[PDB]
Design a protein around this ligand. Structure first.
Ligand SMILES: Cc1cccc(CNC(=O)N2CCC[C@H](C(N)=O)C2)c1
Ligand SMILES: [Zn+2]
Length: 139
């Protein structure tokens, strides 16, 4: 679990979005596993606008932060799950690091701000949905 709170937006994994997220929908994209809903309170976070390929993520299944080197956002095949059929997930960044399904929502940050959130993983890999391209989150 986890979310990004920036301005009057809440960014969550689309597969973990609540009934309240969908009732306050701003934008969603199944191919990216992202959903953004509107909030009444002003958020605590800021979004990186950069091309970093290193950062630090929070891993809930270890209660720890780990440093990572990750690939640029790309189209990567993701096997079928309970949430989606087998498909290519877009804007995904992969890195070597521990992850389990409930780690989804953990934030990846670089020195410039929030980069993305855990979305995929397994076998010593962790995948992050990028949010740096969503310029409208800042306005
Ligand atoms: C995070 C993680 C770590 C170890 C193992 C896994 C395995 N489950 C998944 O790959 N997904 C379930 C949730 C949605 C995912 C998606 N973005 O399509 C797919 C996932
Ligand atoms: Zn950066």
């Amino acid at each position: 679990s986890g979310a990004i709170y920036v301005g009057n937006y809440r960014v969550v994994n689309r597969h973990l979005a609540t009934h309240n997220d969908w009732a306050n929908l701003v934008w969603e994209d199944s191919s990216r596993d992202l959903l953004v809903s509107s909030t009444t309170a002003q958020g605590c976070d800021t979004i990186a606008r950069c091309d970093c390929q290193t950062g630090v993520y929070y891993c809930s299944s270890r209660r720890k932060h780990y440093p990572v080197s990750f690939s640029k956002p790309s189209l990567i095949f993701v096997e079928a799950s309970e949430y989606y059929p087998a498909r290519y997930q877009s804007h995904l960044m992969l890195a070597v690091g521990h992850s389990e399904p409930g780690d989804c929502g953990g934030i990846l940050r670089c020195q410039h701000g929030v980069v993305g959130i855990v979305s995929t993983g397994g076998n010593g890999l962790v995948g992050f949905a990028d949010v740096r391209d969503l310029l409208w989150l800042d306005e």
